[PDB]
């Protein structure tokens, strides 16, 4: 089995976009008038910080980002020189809907628009290198039903 | 409050 090289120290950047305060969405986007502040999200930001620092990544946290601010942060990292890194990780903690995440302003960013900032052509210094995105958000407002199975 | 994203 071929394995991605994972030897640099640090391994790479681990961005954390940690969206908590959705007052602006509530005020500006009529259908989001009741979407709640994401109380407790800092516990995930901290868990990701502990975890990926232990795995030798440089953590880059950002709190409470509108859609425009998210694209600006991603552009900064797309334009950085990752030549001496072996990997790039981006964690997004926010509200979302089908195929999108919401900024704190309730504007929408399609997930493909976030990941595609780091294609090989847009970020050649990450070409051939793993790019990992973790998206903690809803993807709709339906509840996933359960099914009964035998215990393991 | 006690629940989703």
């Amino acid at each position: 089995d071929k394995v991605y090289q994972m030897k640099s120290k640090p391994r790479g950047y681990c961005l954390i976009i940690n969206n908590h305060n959705f007052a602006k969405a509530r005020e500006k986007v009529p259908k989001l008038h009741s979407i709640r502040d994401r109380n407790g999200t800092h516990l995930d930001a901290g868990a990701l910080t502990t975890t990926f620092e232990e795995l030798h990544f440089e953590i880059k946290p950002h709190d409470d980002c509108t859609v425009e601010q998210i694209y600006e942060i991603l552009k900064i990292y797309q334009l950085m020189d990752h030549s001496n890194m072996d990997c790039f990780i981006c964690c997004i903690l926010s509200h979302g809907d089908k195929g999108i995440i919401y900024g704190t302003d309730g504007q929408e960013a399609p997930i493909y628009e976030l990941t595609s900032q780091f294609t090989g052509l847009k970020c050649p210094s990450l070409a051939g290198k793993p790019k990992v995105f973790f998206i903690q958000a809803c993807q709709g407002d339906n509840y996933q039903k359960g099914i009964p199975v035998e215990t393991d | 409050x006690d629940x989703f994203x």
Binding site: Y4, K7, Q139, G140, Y143 | -
Partner: protein, 89 residues
Amino acid sequence: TRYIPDEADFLLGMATVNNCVSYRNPAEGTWYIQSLCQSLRERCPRGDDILTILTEVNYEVSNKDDKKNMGKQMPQPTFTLRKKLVFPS
């Protein structure tokens, strides 16, 4: 030199399949991120790869329940990785 696809070498870890909610316990964190971090911290030092770790996350999150709505949560990775991905420690 060699050429590979522009969209190669990605891993997208979604907390939920499309159309559905994912859960956040305000006093603990989210089902997905807390399970992900626990599995990474336990299994990365053993040399396990990320797809194996994310399979375990699927297993663990699948056993959680929202007993107010009888709800479940199904995480979903998608990938264009061309090699095994390990995070040595």
